[PDB]
Amino acid sequence: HAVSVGKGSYATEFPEIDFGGINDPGFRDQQGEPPATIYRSDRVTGPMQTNSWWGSLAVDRFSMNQYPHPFSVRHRAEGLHVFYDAPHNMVVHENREAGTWHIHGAIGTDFTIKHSGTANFEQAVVDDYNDWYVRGLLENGAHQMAITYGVGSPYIFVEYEDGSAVLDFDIAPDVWEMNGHVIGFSTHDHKHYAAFAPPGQNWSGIGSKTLTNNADYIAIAKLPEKDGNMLAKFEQYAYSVVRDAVADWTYDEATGTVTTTFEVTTEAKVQGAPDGTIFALYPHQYRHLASSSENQLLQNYQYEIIRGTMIGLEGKRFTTELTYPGVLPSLPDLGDYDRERLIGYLHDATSDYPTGSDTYELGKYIGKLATLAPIADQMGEYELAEQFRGELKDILEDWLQATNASGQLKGKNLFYYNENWGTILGYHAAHSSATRINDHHFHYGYFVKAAAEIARADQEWAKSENWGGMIDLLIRDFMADRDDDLFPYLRMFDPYSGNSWADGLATFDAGNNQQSSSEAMHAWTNVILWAEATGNKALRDRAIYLYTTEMSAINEYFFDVHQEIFPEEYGPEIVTINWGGKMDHATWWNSGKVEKYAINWLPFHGGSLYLGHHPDYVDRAYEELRRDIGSTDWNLWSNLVWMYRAFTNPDDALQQMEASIDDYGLFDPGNEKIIERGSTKAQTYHWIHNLAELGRVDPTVTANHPIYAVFNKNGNRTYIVYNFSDSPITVQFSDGHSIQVEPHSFNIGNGD
Ligand SMILES: OC[C@H]1O[C@@H](O[C@@H]2[C@@H](O)[C@H](O)O[C@H](CO)[C@H]2O)[C@H](O)[C@@H](O)[C@@H]1O
Ligand SMILES: OC[C@H]1O[C@@H](O[C@@H]2[C@@H](O)[C@H](O)O[C@H](CO)[C@H]2O)[C@H](O)[C@@H](O)[C@@H]1O
């Protein structure tokens, strides 16, 4: 009932859960499994994809509302409803007492794509998928309608079995261009679309509420404008149905460049149809478009969506280019702190304990210990650092074993492989990590942090035959490569939307969502560190690709650093939860003002420096939070605000820290006013004093190795490298600076 993996194991039978005498129904219901029923055809076998923009198609009989931008769509017994949020559908609402804001559209229907033979389909199943498109199959015996659609596709491709095409409207549309087999039309409220059938198959019902075509293939396009030249361009690719779509990437270690090429492969539905499509690019893509793709832009082809303006680009492929900025295992010892005061805070942290038994609360605790251990090493407190790492080893050697001393499955503190979906689940579970396959990057990222800190000091422990095998299993669950026997590809990540999606099932009418983008960035950071420590180049590079891409989406959709995406009337300077179809300044729990910003900053670690790349943003966001609070009396998590403020004004951060850090004493789970429960006084004091000495993050300098950071204080650069190798290295920076680094050390600020 368990599979050995090095010294560890995972359960292959669902354990008899030890509830610990807790009767709370919510807690008990968490210790379960994801849904038994998966709505997929027999063409889709093996580990099932989860955490996707389209997931509600797999989980609900039909689907919930989905956002294949620029459209929204939903499957129903009667067919596929299609919608586009026009400006008149978009609203920005504020609930002052709740402190929440919501940017959202409507769940309406512009028309329904129907099958002539039935309006009572039995179910809609996933019939195929690739990196960002899905093929949904509405089924009723011989009657079938296969719908191919995707984020960044202004087409919906429709294939019929045993019937023909129907477009049904509640109010008769305006057919403003009638080319026989191709029509340009607008809804009563002036939304512009087109429909395409093979030559000779002419549309009927023009002027009525129901447009019909005898063809067994049609495509729908959202048109950017009521424009016959655009209609003519959409005709060129309307018969090229996307079958394959891959996002292939490379990391150039010398330059830091992460290059991603998005390539489709299509199947021709008429003779001579080109192999290509029209893509709709999101801001995080087109702002980084490779020179070589520029000639494919369709300049005036714009769509407004929740994430700003999408633009059209034609052809088989396009490429984006991003810059990986490095990460560190920890800030080094470069601050002007009182070392005895910091040593005292390190000892104070021995009082801390996890505030729950589930993967998330245990995760926060081990992240806390892993953050303290290098600081203890720096202060010369090696015995204390060893105590922290020993505690990490004790916790991980427990959780990474599924059996007890007698060889029976444990009832808690273990991992289990759900074969139905194909996912590793940890018990105790929380935040629907097991029942909805939620948040695996957020939770398991902390387990990887703990393992990476152990590996930094003890390479033996981290070997695959020891505890490394189980760590690499957890990593595969949340970010597997292609053709993994146990897990779907890159579970958490949507390579086209550019971000992770936290909900395994996506059964919301706003599509999927992600709240803590920083806990996603923390997961990617820790995989980079773990992979560097254990000599796994392929895994490291995949995590670099994720870190760097996710960063591009965070800066657009969570922060809107360019002040182009959020509506002018939206008050806050952050979106807390991004959805497929809407944006909230709100949290998944009842919180105050600080938390609706800081949930996208925490935890602070050696990969957090991406938060400081846009100093005008950091100032604008801080000042807005300060305005709303009305002072620097933060309602909760004060230390996170001080650490954030230190990115641009460490003098201010320092004065706030000095005034309040010692307000309360040792760890108290009931009181997060000053110190957030995943944080410590030691971490806070070490971070702010390091920033005070280093100055600003400098993202204009790259290096030819991946574990580094560059800071700039009034034109004076500080270069930091950590070397995980047994051998000395030389690191070349993009500004001409060159340094040597000894084995298993920082170049500067090793401490002692
Ligand atoms: O959707 C991902 C997020 O899910 C959150 O839990 C949700 C519950 O709070 C709510 O009552 O029910 C929905 C399902 O309808 C749950 O998804 C977690 O708390 C978040 O951590 C998670 O990212
Ligand atoms: O401060 C006590 C409150 O903490 C909340 O936990 C938050 C998580 O839900 C969220 O996923 O992460 C943040 C940051 O780690 C946590 O503070 C509980 O949900 C509340 O019920 C609790 O009162």
Short mmCIF file of N, CA and C in Angstrom, two decimals, residues 590-648:
data_model
loop_
_atom_site.label_atom_id
_atom_site.label_comp_id
_atom_site.label_asym_id
_atom_site.label_seq_id
_atom_site.Cartn_x
_atom_site.Cartn_y
_atom_site.Cartn_z
N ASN A 590 -11.68 36.39 5.64
CA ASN A 590 -12.07 37.74 6.08
C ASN A 590 -10.86 38.44 6.70
N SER A 591 -10.32 39.43 5.98
CA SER A 591 -9.05 40.09 6.36
C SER A 591 -9.24 41.60 6.46
N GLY A 592 -8.19 42.29 6.91
CA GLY A 592 -8.12 43.76 6.89
C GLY A 592 -7.37 44.35 5.71
N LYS A 593 -6.91 45.59 5.88
CA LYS A 593 -6.36 46.39 4.77
C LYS A 593 -4.99 45.91 4.31
N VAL A 594 -4.09 45.68 5.26
CA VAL A 594 -2.70 45.28 4.91
C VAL A 594 -2.70 43.98 4.12
N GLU A 595 -3.54 43.03 4.55
CA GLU A 595 -3.46 41.65 4.01
C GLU A 595 -3.81 41.62 2.53
N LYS A 596 -4.65 42.55 2.10
CA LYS A 596 -5.07 42.57 0.70
C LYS A 596 -3.94 43.08 -0.22
N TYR A 597 -2.86 43.64 0.36
CA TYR A 597 -1.62 43.91 -0.38
C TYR A 597 -0.63 42.79 -0.10
N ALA A 598 -0.39 42.53 1.19
CA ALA A 598 0.77 41.73 1.59
C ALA A 598 0.67 40.24 1.29
N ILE A 599 -0.54 39.74 1.00
CA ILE A 599 -0.67 38.36 0.55
C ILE A 599 0.06 38.12 -0.80
N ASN A 600 0.32 39.20 -1.54
CA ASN A 600 1.14 39.13 -2.74
C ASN A 600 2.60 39.55 -2.55
N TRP A 601 3.02 39.71 -1.29
CA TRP A 601 4.44 39.94 -0.98
C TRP A 601 5.04 38.77 -0.22
N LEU A 602 4.28 38.14 0.66
CA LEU A 602 4.82 37.11 1.55
C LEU A 602 5.01 35.74 0.86
N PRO A 603 5.92 34.90 1.36
CA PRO A 603 6.91 35.21 2.40
C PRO A 603 8.08 36.01 1.82
N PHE A 604 8.85 36.71 2.67
CA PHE A 604 10.12 37.31 2.23
C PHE A 604 11.24 36.30 2.31
N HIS A 605 11.96 36.17 1.20
CA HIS A 605 13.03 35.18 1.10
C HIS A 605 14.03 35.67 0.07
N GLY A 606 15.01 34.83 -0.25
CA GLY A 606 16.08 35.25 -1.15
C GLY A 606 15.68 35.35 -2.62
N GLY A 607 14.48 34.88 -2.97
CA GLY A 607 13.91 35.09 -4.30
C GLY A 607 12.94 36.27 -4.38
N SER A 608 12.79 37.05 -3.31
CA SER A 608 11.75 38.12 -3.25
C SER A 608 12.15 39.41 -3.98
N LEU A 609 13.38 39.49 -4.50
CA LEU A 609 13.89 40.78 -4.97
C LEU A 609 13.16 41.25 -6.22
N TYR A 610 12.46 40.34 -6.91
CA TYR A 610 11.60 40.76 -8.04
C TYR A 610 10.59 41.81 -7.62
N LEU A 611 10.20 41.82 -6.34
CA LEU A 611 9.24 42.81 -5.84
C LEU A 611 9.77 44.25 -5.90
N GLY A 612 11.09 44.39 -6.05
CA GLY A 612 11.73 45.70 -6.01
C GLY A 612 12.18 46.24 -7.35
N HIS A 613 11.83 45.57 -8.45
CA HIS A 613 12.27 46.00 -9.80
C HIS A 613 11.67 47.30 -10.26
N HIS A 614 10.52 47.67 -9.72
CA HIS A 614 9.79 48.87 -10.17
C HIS A 614 9.59 49.81 -8.99
N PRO A 615 10.62 50.61 -8.67
CA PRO A 615 10.54 51.43 -7.45
C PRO A 615 9.40 52.44 -7.42
N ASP A 616 8.99 52.96 -8.58
CA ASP A 616 7.84 53.88 -8.57
C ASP A 616 6.56 53.14 -8.21
N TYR A 617 6.45 51.88 -8.65
CA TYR A 617 5.32 51.06 -8.24
C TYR A 617 5.34 50.81 -6.71
N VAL A 618 6.50 50.42 -6.20
CA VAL A 618 6.62 50.13 -4.75
C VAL A 618 6.22 51.35 -3.92
N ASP A 619 6.67 52.52 -4.35
CA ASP A 619 6.26 53.78 -3.69
C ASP A 619 4.76 54.05 -3.79
N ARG A 620 4.20 53.92 -5.00
CA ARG A 620 2.78 54.18 -5.27
C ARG A 620 1.88 53.24 -4.45
N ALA A 621 2.23 51.94 -4.44
CA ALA A 621 1.45 50.95 -3.70
C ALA A 621 1.55 51.19 -2.19
N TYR A 622 2.77 51.38 -1.67
CA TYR A 622 2.95 51.68 -0.26
C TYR A 622 2.14 52.95 0.14
N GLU A 623 2.24 54.00 -0.67
CA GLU A 623 1.60 55.27 -0.31
C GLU A 623 0.08 55.12 -0.31
N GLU A 624 -0.45 54.26 -1.19
CA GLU A 624 -1.89 54.05 -1.24
C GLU A 624 -2.38 53.28 -0.02
N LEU A 625 -1.64 52.24 0.37
CA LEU A 625 -1.95 51.49 1.58
C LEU A 625 -1.86 52.42 2.81
N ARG A 626 -0.83 53.26 2.82
CA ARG A 626 -0.62 54.18 3.95
C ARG A 626 -1.78 55.17 4.02
N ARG A 627 -2.22 55.67 2.86
CA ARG A 627 -3.36 56.61 2.79
C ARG A 627 -4.60 55.97 3.37
N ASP A 628 -4.87 54.73 2.96
CA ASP A 628 -6.06 54.03 3.41
C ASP A 628 -6.04 53.70 4.89
N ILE A 629 -4.89 53.26 5.39
CA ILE A 629 -4.71 53.02 6.84
C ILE A 629 -4.85 54.34 7.62
N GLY A 630 -4.28 55.41 7.07
CA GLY A 630 -4.34 56.76 7.64
C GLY A 630 -3.15 57.10 8.51
N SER A 631 -2.19 56.17 8.62
CA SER A 631 -0.98 56.36 9.42
C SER A 631 -0.09 55.17 9.12
N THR A 632 0.98 54.99 9.88
CA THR A 632 1.76 53.76 9.78
C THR A 632 1.39 52.77 10.89
N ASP A 633 0.19 52.91 11.46
CA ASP A 633 -0.31 51.94 12.43
C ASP A 633 -1.01 50.79 11.67
N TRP A 634 -0.20 49.87 11.16
CA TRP A 634 -0.71 48.79 10.28
C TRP A 634 -1.66 47.90 11.05
N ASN A 635 -2.78 47.52 10.43
CA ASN A 635 -3.81 46.76 11.14
C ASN A 635 -3.36 45.35 11.51
N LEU A 636 -2.46 44.79 10.69
CA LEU A 636 -1.89 43.47 10.89
C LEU A 636 -0.62 43.36 10.06
N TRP A 637 0.23 42.39 10.41
CA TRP A 637 1.43 42.06 9.63
C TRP A 637 2.38 43.24 9.42
N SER A 638 2.56 44.05 10.47
CA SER A 638 3.35 45.28 10.33
C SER A 638 4.71 45.00 9.70
N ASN A 639 5.34 43.91 10.14
CA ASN A 639 6.70 43.62 9.69
C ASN A 639 6.80 43.45 8.18
N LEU A 640 5.76 42.86 7.56
CA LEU A 640 5.75 42.72 6.11
C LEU A 640 5.70 44.07 5.41
N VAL A 641 4.96 45.02 5.98
CA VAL A 641 4.91 46.36 5.41
C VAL A 641 6.29 47.04 5.53
N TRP A 642 6.95 46.89 6.69
CA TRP A 642 8.28 47.48 6.85
C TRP A 642 9.28 46.90 5.85
N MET A 643 9.24 45.58 5.67
CA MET A 643 10.15 44.91 4.73
C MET A 643 9.91 45.35 3.29
N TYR A 644 8.63 45.50 2.93
CA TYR A 644 8.27 46.00 1.60
C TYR A 644 8.76 47.45 1.39
N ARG A 645 8.53 48.29 2.39
CA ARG A 645 8.90 49.70 2.33
C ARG A 645 10.39 49.85 2.13
N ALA A 646 11.16 48.90 2.68
CA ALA A 646 12.62 48.94 2.57
C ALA A 646 13.14 48.83 1.14
N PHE A 647 12.30 48.37 0.19
CA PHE A 647 12.72 48.36 -1.21
C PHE A 647 13.02 49.76 -1.75
N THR A 648 12.37 50.78 -1.21
CA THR A 648 12.59 52.15 -1.72
C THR A 648 12.95 53.17 -0.66
#
